Every structure is written in C-alpha cells, then in structure tokens.
Design an enzyme around this catalytic site. Structure first.
Site, PDB file in Angstrom:
ATOM      1  N   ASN A 297       0.963  34.065  40.496  1.00  0.00           N
ATOM      2  CA  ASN A 297       1.376  33.725  41.886  1.00  0.00           C
ATOM      3  C   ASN A 297       0.671  34.661  42.880  1.00  0.00           C
ATOM      4  O   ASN A 297       0.253  35.742  42.534  1.00  0.00           O
ATOM      5  CB  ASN A 297       2.884  33.845  42.073  1.00  0.00           C
TER       6      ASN A 297
ATOM      7  N   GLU B 211       5.336  21.372  35.359  1.00  0.00           N
ATOM      8  CA  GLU B 211       5.206  22.861  35.414  1.00  0.00           C
ATOM      9  C   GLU B 211       4.150  23.314  34.404  1.00  0.00           C
ATOM     10  O   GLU B 211       3.374  24.231  34.698  1.00  0.00           O
ATOM     11  CB  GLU B 211       6.557  23.508  35.137  1.00  0.00           C
TER      12      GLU B 211
ATOM     13  N   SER C   2       3.323  38.202  41.072  1.00  0.00           N
ATOM     14  CA  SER C   2       4.216  37.760  39.980  1.00  0.00           C
ATOM     15  C   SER C   2       3.431  36.715  39.147  1.00  0.00           C
ATOM     16  O   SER C   2       2.379  36.275  39.552  1.00  0.00           O
ATOM     17  CB  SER C   2       5.515  37.269  40.518  1.00  0.00           C
TER      18      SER C   2
ATOM     19  N   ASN D  13       9.507  32.681  36.655  1.00  0.00           N
ATOM     20  CA  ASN D  13       8.803  33.681  37.483  1.00  0.00           C
ATOM     21  C   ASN D  13       9.284  35.116  37.237  1.00  0.00           C
ATOM     22  O   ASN D  13      10.489  35.373  37.323  1.00  0.00           O
ATOM     23  CB  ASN D  13       9.007  33.266  38.931  1.00  0.00           C
TER      24      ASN D  13
ATOM     25  N   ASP E  86       1.814  36.502  45.227  1.00  0.00           N
ATOM     26  CA  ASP E  86       2.518  37.784  45.448  1.00  0.00           C
ATOM     27  C   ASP E  86       2.256  38.763  44.299  1.00  0.00           C
ATOM     28  O   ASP E  86       2.809  39.863  44.363  1.00  0.00           O
ATOM     29  CB  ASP E  86       4.008  37.549  45.696  1.00  0.00           C
TER      30      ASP E  86
ATOM     31  N   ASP F 234      22.271  29.376  40.026  1.00  0.00           N
ATOM     32  CA  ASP F 234      22.269  30.481  41.021  1.00  0.00           C
ATOM     33  C   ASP F 234      22.544  29.989  42.451  1.00  0.00           C
ATOM     34  O   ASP F 234      22.583  30.822  43.343  1.00  0.00           O
ATOM     35  CB  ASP F 234      20.976  31.293  40.960  1.00  0.00           C
TER      36      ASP F 234
ATOM     37  N   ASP G 110       4.243  33.211  36.436  1.00  0.00           N
ATOM     38  CA  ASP G 110       5.174  32.215  35.868  1.00  0.00           C
ATOM     39  C   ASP G 110       4.816  31.996  34.396  1.00  0.00           C
ATOM     40  O   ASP G 110       3.617  31.841  34.073  1.00  0.00           O
ATOM     41  CB  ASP G 110       5.084  30.889  36.602  1.00  0.00           C
TER      42      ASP G 110
HETATM   43  V   LIG Z   1       6.802  34.676  44.214  1.00  0.00           V
END
Ligand SMILES: [V+3]
Ligand code: NA
EC number: 3.2.1.17
Length: 129
Positions: A46, A35, A50, A59, A48, A101, A52
């Site tokens: 990212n 990562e 967002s 994220n 979209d 989650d 990280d």
């Molecule tokens: V995303």
C-alpha cells in the site's frame, strides 16, 4: 495455493463465514476473487507502507505484524506470514474480527467496488458446498 471457486466456497463455509454478520457465502467468495484471485500467497504493498496479505488481502496497518509497518497495530495477534498459508484458518479468523468492527465488508475495497449490490449468489452457483 490457488483455490478453485467452489473449493474456496466449501472451505469458507466449513470455517463459519456463510452468513457471518449477515454476509452470504457469495460475498466472501467474490471478495476473495477480486482481492487475491483466490491465491493464498498474494501480497500487495500500500501507498502508506503497509502491505495486504493472503486470500482476503488483510492489511498490516491494523491487523497483523509484518516487521516493517511502523506505528501499526496487530489486532488479529498474528504475523502477517500466517495469512499466506494453504490453510485459510488464520485469514478466516482475522476476517471475522475485521467484519465485526463496525464497517462490515466495506473494509475490503474490492468488495465495496466489485461485489456490493451485485448478484453474489452467482459465485457459489453449481458448488457442492
Ligand atoms: V493503509
Ligand atoms: Na501491524
């Protein structure tokens, strides 16, 4: 801070990740290597919009507030900048929420594609933990 492999393994073990939700320490070390290259300052945007953040690339779409991810959640209740500290406490505590989650470590694309189903014990070989 750029951790060494065994220094990160020891920090992760001290913060309770070894066999957390059944994921051995080597899984977490492998995930951090692919990562962030073990760099607490790593950031990546990212598609979209967002971003990280940190050693486990957490994220902003779900987990933290970075002031620029519209319509997102802050489920770890932290500014994303907290995830960049030389102290991995905030990243570890947020990662425990993520892995709990329902999706386990499949949340980490690098873990799914580079660590899952490999000999992850190799990542902690030789470490005094
Ligand atoms: V995303
Ligand atoms: Na967010």
């Amino acid at each position: 801070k750029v951790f060494g492999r065994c220094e990160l393994a020891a920090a992760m073990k001290r913060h309770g990740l070894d066999n957390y939700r059944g994921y051995s320490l080597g899984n977490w070390v492998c995930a951090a290597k692919f990562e962030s290259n073990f760099n607490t300052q790593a950031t990546n945007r990212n598609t979209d919009g967002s971003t990280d953040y940190g050693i486990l690339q957490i994220n902003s779409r779900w987990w933290c507030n970075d002031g620029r991810t519209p319509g997102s959640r802050n489920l770890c209740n932290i500014p994303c900048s907290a995830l960049l500290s030389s102290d991995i406490t905030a990243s570890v505590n947020c990662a425990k929420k993520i892995v709990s989650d329902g999706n386990g470590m499949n949340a980490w694309v690098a873990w799914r594609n580079r660590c899952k189903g490999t000999d992850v014990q190799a990542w902690i070989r030789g470490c005094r933990l």
